[PDB]
Amino acid sequence: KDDDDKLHSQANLMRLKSDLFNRSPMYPGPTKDDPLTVTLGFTLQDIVKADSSTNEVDLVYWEQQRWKLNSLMWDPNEYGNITDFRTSAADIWTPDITAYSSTRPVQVLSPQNALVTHDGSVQYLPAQRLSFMCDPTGVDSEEGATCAVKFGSWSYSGFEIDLKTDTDQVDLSSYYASSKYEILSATQTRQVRFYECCKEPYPDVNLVVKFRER
Amino acid sequence: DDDKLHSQANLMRLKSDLFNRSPMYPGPTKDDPLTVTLGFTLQDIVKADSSTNEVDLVYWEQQRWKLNSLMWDPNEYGNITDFRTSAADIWTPDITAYSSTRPVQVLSPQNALVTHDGSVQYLPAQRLSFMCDPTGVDSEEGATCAVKFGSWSYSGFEIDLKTDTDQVDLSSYYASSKYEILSATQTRQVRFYECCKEPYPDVNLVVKFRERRA
Amino acid sequence: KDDDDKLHSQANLMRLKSDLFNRSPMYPGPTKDDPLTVTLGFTLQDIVKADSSTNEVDLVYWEQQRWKLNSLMWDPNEYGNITDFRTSAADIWTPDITAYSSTRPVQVLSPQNALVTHDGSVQYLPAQRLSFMCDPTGVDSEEGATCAVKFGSWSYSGFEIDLKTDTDQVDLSSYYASSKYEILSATQTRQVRFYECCKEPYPDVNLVVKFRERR
Amino acid sequence: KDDDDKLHSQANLMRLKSDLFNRSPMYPGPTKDDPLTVTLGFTLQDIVKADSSTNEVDLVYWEQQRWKLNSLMWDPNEYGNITDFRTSAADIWTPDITAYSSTRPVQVLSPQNALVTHDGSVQYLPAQRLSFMCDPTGVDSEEGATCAVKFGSWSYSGFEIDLKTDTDQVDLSSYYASSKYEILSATQTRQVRFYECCKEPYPDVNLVVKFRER
Amino acid sequence: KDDDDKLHSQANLMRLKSDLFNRSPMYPGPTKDDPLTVTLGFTLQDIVKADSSTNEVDLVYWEQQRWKLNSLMWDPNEYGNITDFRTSAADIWTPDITAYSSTRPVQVLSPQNALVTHDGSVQYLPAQRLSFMCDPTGVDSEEGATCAVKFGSWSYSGFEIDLKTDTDQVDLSSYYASSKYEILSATQTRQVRFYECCKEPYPDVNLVVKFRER
Ligand SMILES: [Ca+2]
Ligand SMILES: [Ca+2]
Ligand SMILES: [Ca+2]
Ligand SMILES: [Ca+2]
Ligand SMILES: [Ca+2]
Description:
Assembly: pentameric
Keywords: Mutated Acetylcholine Binding Protein, Binding Protein
PDB class: receptor
Strand content of chain A: 35-45%
Radius of gyration of chain A: 20 Å
Chains A, B, C, D, E: Soluble acetylcholine receptor
Largest sheet of chain A: 8 strands, mixed
CATH class of chain A: Mainly Beta
Bound molecules: calcium ion
Oligomer: homopentamer
Order of helices and strands of chain A: HEEEEEEEEEEEE
Number of domains of chain A: 1
Helix content of chain A: under 10%
Entry title: Ac-AChBP ligand binding domain mutated to human alpha-7 nAChR (intermediate)
Number of strands of chain A: 12
Number of helices of chain A: 1
CATH superfamily of chain A: Neurotransmitter-gated ion-channel ligand-binding domain
CATH architecture of chain A: Distorted Sandwich
Shape of chain A: globular
């Protein structure tokens, strides 16, 4: 029937993934000779808890992560005109992007699956709840409290993974309307760290949150 | 007994033919869409926390959907109309609560039921913590919080959603719960984010609840 | 001498296990054409906590389940007079029994291993901590508080898994004598339910507990 | 040259582990025909917490399991004089030894790796935290509180696994000097249980602890 | 293009890794005849909490670990002038270093990947959160409170793993300034114990922290 056509479609996809994944061992990840740029952005959904005793604060957000590999690339025409597909994040390489301030291991609130597009670009969007070092003090005043946490590669250097932001403006469109706390400013600024011990740049994306109780 | 051996063999052969012989289903495509039906059975509201503005639910979430590739003729399979299977042996939809502040906990064995026409019924029971403002939970009107459920990585063109009723199922609601239910609904909506020209469905659970005075 | 003889038992069990399990395809589970019965019963060790705020109660108990598979059947003479063995519960089908009204994922206190006997009967004894839905009002009256939780197949009906008890009363023989909570009465009894929607039976074992604070 | 000798010793160890484990099948565990004796002893590090609300107490201890199997036995002469080796607990059979009266799944504080000796004897020293049933009353009394816990096989009778202790003396030499509770006495004693229902013996080691606040 | 050398540099790395990890079976560990020296160092980040009912304090640090394996060496000129690479820590052997006085299974805050360099050296930098045994009494004094915890191999003696520090000074450059507690002193110092049971030495690196509130 028109049944036959949906099968054809599955097969082009079952075929496309196999060619991508099962016909090379694995992407070793980026190197100084193959570099990689990861674009970060944040949508801040909530500030759930501010804790004066430990000076820890707990956020819920979605971290948009975007990077392009030549190793995932295909002619849609060879594959039934498939321009993209969804797949398990465990089937691909994902950058090691970590907060440098976490006081507790991140918890993942969303299915780990990513979108891969024929030009070789991957867009992964993990929702996470994160506890990090923050001093809430002033959160009950009208000026509020100010906290910052940095994100970047844990193990690579600017020569292998670089970070980039589409905007310095964190996305509040989805922020919880009734959250215990309200948001004055949120911004995401890319920076470069240097260390005396080394000749390389270490990039990070700085999240600054300015909030107070409703 | 004699025939018991056969029924056994008939089932194993069926699952071999569905799963060993045929590869992993790649999931829905723009050219091979799904529709997942949602319904909720609310069982308890366990805790309301106004420090963090978080509420905890226990419910059963029913998911039903259909794949041709799970389809078979009972007469080659010894009149097997349906069978129960581990959920890991099949593709399941990546359906997530959009406002969860803690990773969902699963309270039930994860197994599903597949019927000869290719339909799957999956009914996971969960504890969810989502963003809710309890204010007014001690008062006659109660409080109103809502949470949405949708695919995380797929748009309406690939995974679509419907409900059987807009009425959430309260027949199992624990009668001594600290909170009593004033109303519970599950409603299907579509949103556009115009970064993209295609629909995003979600099922919206709205619950109004009140401390049980008694 | 007898070291060498003990070495033969070891190879016989190794071989029984190999013949049963990975020389046989994974058992599909019960059918309506191949049904089974699970016998359930509880040994209640502790009432750990009763939360008046969230209305949930934490129990510790060992849950005895038994069932009999024909596929696990064997003749002890072909296998060296081996009548039974301990095995990893991951190595065999186990039933889907679950508490119907828990508020948290159940926690296993015990290694998970099962005993397999040559008639194909299996005994499994998970020790658990369970938070179920409970209103601990009156815990401080001589009348005490009463809560109940049901266990049963989550995905199978009475036509694939029948469910039952050996005795109708929870084993209190191991109950912690210094827990904050005394037990007035503890019950486990089978019930069968039907639904309007569907014509087939759903069995469950209903566990009912009455408890006081310890004076 | 000095290296080759370092290199050659690795080859010898690798060779032995291969002969021992992947060459031979996984040991099924004890039988009534192949009984096994497990030696238990405790080193009590800390009493972390006592909850007089729920009546549970929290210990941090190191448990020393030791046992022996001919299957692990080797002649060091064929192994370049290798007497012993360290390995992960996954690579070998371990007794299923559990606290009978725990209220919480045990948390393992140490890397799980054991020591096998050429006479076929394993020594396993897992560091754990345990929450078990204890009623604290008196802990602020000179007399102190006494609680007690049993350890033994969850699934095996005295006919498959027998228990012993090297000594009856619990080792307090590593106990935390500044712990909230000072230890009064601690004893580890072998017991054997019988049931009317069944003919066979169940041993256990009963750990008894008398403690009070500092 | 220059997508080639990118392609070839990528090809060279996969070849190197397979030549290390798939030529020869995973390495057996150090042995008295193939001993190993691990260098430890600590970057202390935050003291997150001090619980004085249980006497437990919580640290967030990054432990630096280095060791050299002959079996990890290669010749850059055979491998494309590659001088080092980043890899998952699961692919390679790692030492059993742990905290001797922890009260909870330690938590891992960072992606676990290590840096392997051509001379066979590995740098691993786990970020951890540790709850250990600490009597915080005095934390409100001018003097503040002093606590200590030891680190070292769990199963390995000094004959197989030795410990070393580059400096006896913990690295406070990353310490969180708005942290609830101030750091008066921090030292990491090699010690060597003889345990009476066993003939050989067991070194540890003793972490000493003097901190107070404010
Ligand atoms: Ca870094
Ligand atoms: Ca979305
Ligand atoms: Ca049901
Ligand atoms: Ca027992
Ligand atoms: Ca030690």
